[PDB]
Amino acid sequence: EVQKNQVLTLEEWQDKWVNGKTAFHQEQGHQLLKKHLDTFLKGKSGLRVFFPLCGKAVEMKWFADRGHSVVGVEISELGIQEFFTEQNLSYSEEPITEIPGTKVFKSSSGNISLYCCSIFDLPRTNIGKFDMIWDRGALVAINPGDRKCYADTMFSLLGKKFQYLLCVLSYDPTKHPGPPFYVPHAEIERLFGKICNIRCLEKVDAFEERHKSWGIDCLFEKLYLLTEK
């Protein structure tokens, strides 16, 4: 209930990128994913992997380097450009014909495509189906009221068998209004429990010096693996 009425705008997010206020970004990449990556990919070849609200997530290159095709969606053209610049990847552009005024950025390698539009635009595209989702700073970045629509959008993107990897943050929601927002276990169950087997693989201290600026003094991260019932 606490953060329920928080409504951020796309322009606010784009402004963060313009202003360099991108402290959510992890240059060395996600350490829980790094730990479990081989287990998740064991026996797997040429998967399609989706990154909602992808920013310039370095982990997209982890999957592409391992032979999987990666699609991300990110509202900030600046963040997308920073991804290609930082990963030293050439790219070219095409329109997203269904959503006038927007573009998809395609790595020359053919392995990474970043849609520069809203995640909520995707059901009107032919983005298709995915074997795997990496969701970090995404479900937690969405306006709280938008979570059900987001969850339904995720389901629309999933193949019959899937591994949905989900990172959420645990902190006292009365101390920081978000983002990132507080998504408790019960909320995961509400959104994903009917369709998914839910495993919480990790719960680790995530508190860094930068988190003092949110007015909290404890922060934990949980890594979930959601799969078909």
Ligand X SMILES: Nc1ncnc2c1ncn2[C@@H]1O[C@H](CSCC[C@H](N)C(=O)O)[C@@H](O)[C@H]1O
* 229 known ligand binder: no
Going by C-beta distance under 8 Å and a sequence separation of 6 or more, which residues neighbour residue 20?
A: none
Considering beta carbons, is residue 36 or 193 the nearer one to ligand X?
Answer: 36
Which residues on neighbouring strands pair with residue 222, listed in sequence order? 168, 203
Considering beta carbons, is residue 72 or 173 the nearer one to ligand X?
Answer: 72
- In 3D space, the residue among 120, 119, 154 whose CA is nearest the CA of residue 224 turns out to be 154
* 212 known ligand binder: no
Calpha distance 136→155 (Å, rounded): 17
* 26 known ligand binder: no
Please, what is the minimum distance in Å from the beta carbon of residue 176 to ligand X?
Answer: 15
Please, what is the minimum distance in Å from the beta carbon of residue 160 to ligand X?
Answer: 26
Considering beta carbons, is residue 27 or 229 the nearer one to ligand X?
Answer: 27
Q: Which residues bind to ligand X, rule: CB under 6 A?
A: 13, 24-25, 53-55, 57, 73-76, 79, 118-120, 136-138, 141
Which residues on neighbouring strands pair with residue 50, listed in sequence order? 71, 133
3-state secondary structure 9-59: CHHHHHHHHHHCCCCCCCCCCCHHHHHHHHHHHCCCCCCEEEECCCCCCCH
* 119 known ligand binder: yes
Residues annotated in the binding site for S-adenosyl-L-methionine, as ranges? Answer: 13-24, 53, 74, 118-119, 136
Q: Which residues are annotated as a binding site for substrate?
A: 24
Q: Mark the binding-site residues, compressed into ranges.
A: 13-24, 53, 74, 118-119, 136
